[PDB]
Amino acid sequence: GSLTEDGLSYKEKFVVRSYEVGSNKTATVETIANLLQEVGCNHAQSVGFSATTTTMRKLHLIWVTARMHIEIYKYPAWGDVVEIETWCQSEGRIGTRRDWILKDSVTGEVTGRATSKWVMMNQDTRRLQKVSDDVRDEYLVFCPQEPRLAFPEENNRSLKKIPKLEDPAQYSMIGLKPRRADLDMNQHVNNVTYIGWVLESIPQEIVDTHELQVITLDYRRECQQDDVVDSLTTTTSNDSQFLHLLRLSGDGQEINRGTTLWRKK
């Protein structure tokens, strides 16, 4: 992959693999989500991140995900090439945004888009805090300074407030735990695993007769390597919508909330 001409965005091509696809022989939303992170990390490397600015490293600070939002119009087939463009933007003192555009390599038509909100956190204490002006200065030179949104629309679904699922839940999947393959290189649960866990409460019948169109996922706390998770779904609706809650079963601590939206094939 590579930096565009202006050096303010990054593109990479991916061939969809046999094991990356579901029962339709098209890419799963967990697969899309892993390619979104691979191309993110490849952009980070390309602009010099050995992913922390100098001020970040001196204050033991990191980017962490507060929200992921993914809209898929077509899931690429087994053997197909998808093209993903990525870029970041400063959201002033609040945090940063990474956005993505997925294309069919052959047609050049937009097949997907995704937006994400990141906040600063102390790695040691886990305390959230503001982007300082020193840090802003530092990474603002890798970012288009005029707006560039994957989701421009005036009331797009990617910014909506998400409520807490009320007990009892219409569906549930109980006693979910990560294995070593769920962990990243820093031994934290991969952010994509949460997507998988949220979807495990969707009944097989919805998955067999529908196509996932939108997923909006808030991150509240992390699951540790020795935590166990309960996944809770309630239908809220030709389009099926759901509301989602992930919580630790060792006391019911909220770890993620979310909404999905599915159209019949």
For 194-206, b/e burial (b = at least 16 CB within 10 A) is bbbbbbebbeeeb
Whether the Cβ atoms of residue 163 and residue 9 lie closer than 8 Å to each other: no
The answer to whether residue 186 is catalytic is yes
Please pick, from the candidates 26, 96, 111, 191, the single residue that binds ligand NVJ as defined by CB under 6 A: 191
Kindly tell me which residue out of 29, 44, 61, 82 binds ligand NVJ, with binding defined by CB under 6 A: 44
For residue 211, the cross-strand partners are: 263
36 makes contact with ligand NVJ (CB under 6 A): yes
Residue 60 annotated to the active site: no
116 part of the interface to ligand NVJ, by CB under 6 A:
yes
Contact between 25 and a copy of itself by CB under 8 A: the answer reads: yes
Of the residues 69, 210, 223, 244, which is catalytic? 223
Out of 7, 41, 58, 235, which residue is the one contacting a copy of itself (CB under 8 A)? 41
Please give, one letter per residue, the 3-state secondary structure of the chain.
Answer: CEECCCCCCEEEEEECCHHHECCCCEECHHHHHHHHHHHHHHHHHHCCCCCCCHHHHHCCEEEEEEEEEEEECCCCECCCEEEEEEEEEEECCCEEEEEEEEEECCCCCEEEEEEEEEEEEECCCCCEECCCHHHHHHHHCCCCCCCCCCCCCCCCHHHCCCCCCCCCCCEEEEEECCCHHHECCCCCECHHHHHHHHHCCCCHHHHHHEEEEEEEEEECCCCCCCCCEEEEEEECCCEEEEEEEEEECCCCCEEEEEEEEEEEC
Look up 223 and say whether it is catalytic: yes
Given 55, 65, 89, 132, the residue binding ligand NVJ (CB under 6 A): 65
Give me the least distance between CB of 86 and a copy of itself, in Å please. Answer: 13
Q: With CB under 8 A as the contact rule, which of the stretches 37-45, 61-69, 97-105, 148-156 interacts with a copy of itself? A: 37-45
Residue 27 binding target from a copy of itself, ligand NVJ, none, CB below 5 to 8 Å by type: none
- Considering only residues 222 through 251, tell me which ones interact with ligand NVJ, judged by CB under 6 A: none
**Of residues 37 and 90, the one with the C-beta less far from a copy of itself:** 37
Catalytic residue among 24, 34, 42, 188: 188
Please report how close the Cβ of residue 25 comes to a copy of itself at its closest, in angstroms. Answer: 5
Query: If binding is defined by CB under 6 A, does position 40 make contact with ligand NVJ?
Result: yes
The residue (of 189 and 192) whose beta carbon lies closer to ligand NVJ is 192
Question: Minimum distance between the CB of residue 46 and a copy of itself, rounded to whole angstroms?
Answer: 11
Residues labelled as active-site residues: 186, 188, 223
